[PDB]
Paper text:
[name] is the most abundant GPCR in the central nervous system (CNS) and regulates diverse brain functions and behaviors, modulating neurotransmitter release and neuronal excitation through pre-synaptic activation of Gi/o, GIRK channels, and arrestin/MAP kinase signaling. To gain further insight into the molecular mechanisms of cannabinoid system modulators and enable structure-based ligand design, we sought to crystallize and solve the atomic structure of the human [name] receptor. [name]'s orthosteric binding pocket is highly hydrophobic, as expected for a lipid-activated receptor.
We incorporated the point mutation T210A, which was previously shown to stabilize the inactive conformation of [name] and increase thermostability. Finally, we truncated CB1T210A-PGS by eliminating the first 89 N-terminal residues and the C-terminus after residue 421. Taranabant makes multiple contacts to both TM1 and TM7 and fills the orthosteric pocket directly inside the TM1-TM7 opening, potentially acting as a ‘plug’ to block endocannabinoid entrance. Taranabant adopts a conformation in which the chlorophenyl moiety extends toward TM5, the cyanophenyl buries deeper into the 7TM bundle, and the trifluoromethylpyridine projects into the putative access channel between TM1 and TM7. In contrast, a large number of hydrophobic residues (including 6 Phe, 3 Met, 2 Trp, 3 Leu, and 3 Ile sidechains) line the orthosteric pocket and make a variety of hydrophobic contacts to taranabant, burying 1109 Å2 of surface area. The major divergence between [name] and CB2 within the subset of binding residues lies in the membrane-proximal N-terminal region, where F102, M103, D104, I105, and F108 make van der Waals contacts to taranabant.
Numbering used by the authors: 100 to 301, 1001 to 1196, 333 to 412
């Protein structure tokens, strides 16, 4: 019942032991060293240590140290001095490794929130994820992890319970594992949805959402567009988005157009409503079209390059959202000098300032209907400054997001590697508890074990490869 006995898992040559013993210490010590080094680096760096976005690195590196140091201690403690492990020492050793894995998952979860918020709320992030808060998140996350890991030492082992002990690990209760694997498994799933959501929905293409693809005068482009829809020249508001309830507020906008409809000012305005969803709001929106010929609806799926021609041409872009994950429409629109009239939600709060657009109360056709009116009076002066102000700000945001989406991808990589190393092993462990174990499989377990250590090796290296800032902070020493 000794920890890290490869021998209950397979019989070895003296050669293979020799080989393994050498790959083990040399790798183990190596992996201990580089993860120390990672720590000694971020802790000497003012920049790194107490920046929230890089807090997971410090957390992974104690996570990788915890397991690697326990690998190498346990190995020495067994194979060199031949001390043998009591229940509680064994359990403390295993508690060390689970704790490390939990904390790894803990760190990617807390990082994944850090990334969402950094892109969801680019300004407000800096006051939402603050240094003291960041630390308290990590401490809690670590104490939970440590707490879950010590449970077997307080009696949730199979010994103090007398319940079926696992085939795989001595001194431990099988369904305690299931708890521990399940917590971590589901939490992995949410971390993956999370990162995926961020990566499919976040940011824009600054190579494509760019004024420079358009030739001419805005006026000329506007007039040409407007005649393509057989309307005369007139202030042109665009909506593009899902037709739906309580999400992208085309229902709010269709209310606002009926408010204005009677006004004299309305005949001065032009509405281009683009999108699809509810058959009802389409029915409604189509009726407003056949009612007024200064309204124009498009459910026909539209060319992205045309949507850029639109952003390039219309005066205002109307974003009546109840919810806006990453404010893409706004950012694209403004990049091309469309001034945004938008609900004051998510990042729209951070993005639109008083010198770049108009904000309203979500859900309110009256606050919108007036916005539009203020926007039609605003358009009696010149809007060049506004569209210019819009362009840069959006650029700034677009870039910041490109940075923060990069740090996100690093963490996806770190995740993918982490699922890869540990994925097989937990599958096997679940497989072990449930069902029946083999004696081949028992070996590919022991083999897969080492990928736990391997993961701890490669994490420091991709920090190194993937973040200049880590790299530069390390050169600050020598
Ligand atoms: C490599 C360890 N595997 C084993 O102890 C078993 C499963 C007996 O197989 C082996 C396989 C190889 C070795 C050897 F000789 F290379 F060190 C020792 N044991 C594994 C055991 C393990 C325990 C708990 C979890 Cl959740 C995962 C793996 C472990 C031990 C200590 C630190 C880390 C890390 N990072 C990983």
């Amino acid at each position: 019942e000794n920890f890290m006995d490869i021998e209950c898992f397979m019989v070895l040559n003296p050669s293979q032991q020799l080989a393994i013993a050498v790959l083990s210490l040399t790798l183990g010590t190596f992996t201990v060293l580089e993860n120390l080094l990672v720590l000694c680096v971020i802790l000497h760096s003012r920049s790194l240590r107490c920046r929230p976005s890089y807090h997971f690195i410090g957390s992974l590196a104690v996570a990788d140290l915890l397991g690697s140091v326990i690998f190498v201690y346990s190995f020495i403690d067994f194979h060199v001095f031949h001390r043998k492990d009591s229940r509680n020492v064994f359990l403390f050793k295993l508690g060390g490794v689970t704790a490390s894995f939990t904390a790894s998952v803990g760190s990617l979860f807390l990082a994944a929130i850090d990334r969402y918020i950094s892109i969801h709320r680019p300004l407000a992030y800096k006051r939402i994820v603050t240094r003291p808060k960041a630390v308290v998140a990590f401490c809690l996350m670590w104490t939970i992890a440590i707490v879950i890991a010590v449970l077997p030492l307080l009696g949730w082992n199979c010994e103090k319970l007398q319940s079926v002990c696992s085939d795989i690990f001595p001194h431990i209760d099988e369904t305690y594992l299931m708890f521990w694997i399940g917590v971590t498994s589901v939490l992995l799933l949410f971390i993956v949805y999370a990162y995926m959501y961020i990566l499919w929905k976040a940011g824009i293409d600054c190579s494509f959402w760019n004024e420079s693809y358009l030739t001419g005068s805005r006026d000329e482009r506007k007039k040409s567009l407007l005649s393509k829809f057989g309307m005369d020249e007139g202030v042109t508001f665009m909506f593009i988005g899902r037709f739906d309830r309580g999400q992208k507020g085309v229902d709010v906008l269709l209310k606002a157009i009926e408010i204005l409809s009677s006004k004299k000012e309305f005949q001065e305005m032009r509405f281009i409503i683009i999108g699809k969803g509810d058959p009802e709001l389409e029915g409604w929106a189509r009726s407003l079209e056949e009612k007024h010929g200064n309204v124009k609806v498009i459910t026909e799926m539209l060319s992205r390059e045309f949507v850029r021609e639109l952003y390039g041409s219309v005066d205002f872009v109307i974003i009546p959202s109840y919810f806006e994950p990453f404010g893409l429409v706004a950012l694209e629109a403004m990049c091309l000098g469309a001034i945004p009239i938008a609900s004051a939600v998510g990042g729209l709060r951070d993005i639109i300032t008083n010198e770049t657009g108009i904000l309203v109360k979500a859900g309110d056709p009256g606050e919108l209907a007036n916005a539009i009116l203020k926007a039609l009076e605003l358009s009696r002066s010149d809007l060049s400054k506004f569209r210019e102000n819009c362009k840069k700000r959006a650029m700034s945001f677009s870039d910041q997001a490109r940075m923060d989406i990069r740090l996100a991808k690093t963490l996806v990589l770190i995740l993918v590697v982490l699922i890869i190393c540990w994925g097989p092993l937990l599958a096997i462990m679940v497989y072990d508890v449930f069902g029946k174990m083999n004696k081949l499989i028992k070996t590919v377990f022991a083999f897969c074990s080492m990928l736990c250590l391997l993961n701890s090796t490669v994490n420091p290296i991709i920090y190194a490869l993937r973040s200049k800032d880590l790299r530069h902070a390390f050169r600050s020493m020598f």
